[PDB]
Amino acid sequence: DSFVIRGDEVRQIAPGQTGKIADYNYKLPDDFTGCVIAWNSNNLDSKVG
Amino acid sequence: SALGKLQDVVNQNAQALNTLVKQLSSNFGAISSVLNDILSRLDKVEAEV
Numbered sequence: 001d002s003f004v005i006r007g008d009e010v011r012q013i014a015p016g017q018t019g020k021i022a023d024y025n026y027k028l029p030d031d032f033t034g035c036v037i038a039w040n041s042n043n044l045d046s047k048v049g
Numbered sequence: 050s051a052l053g054k055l056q057d058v059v060n061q062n063a064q065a066l067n068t069l070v071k072q073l074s075s076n077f078g079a080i081s082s083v084l085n086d087i088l089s090r091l092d093k094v095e096a097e098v
Contacts, residue, residue, distance in 0.1 A: 016094030030094060 001026075004045065010038055 005013070005021060012019030013036055015028040022028075074082045081087055087096055 016092060018092070 004041075007040075013038070 003026065009019065009021045011017060012021040013026070013028070015032045016030060076082055079087065080090065090096060
């Protein structure tokens with residue numbers, strides 16, 4: 001599952017949490033079996049404009 | 050005092066029933082003895098504990 005979010009919304013990706021991300025667009029089940037991987041891509045995706 | 054044995058048997062049965070009933074109000078280390086109170090509280094992942 002590949003997606004880009006805000007740096008403060010990383011805590012909402014964890015299963016069984018709150019927030020707009022975990023309740024409106026992307027929610028993980030309580031029996032999620034896997035790992036969550038995230039890294040910064042400021043110099044890759046973000047633009048000065 | 051003639052039917053003391055029967056009275057003691059009945060009293061023991063009644064006391065066992067009353068103790069089994071009253072053992073519901075205990076917390077056993079939880080936050081409250083009422084399940085509806087725990088449901089109207091911290092999320093399911095933390096309420097299962």
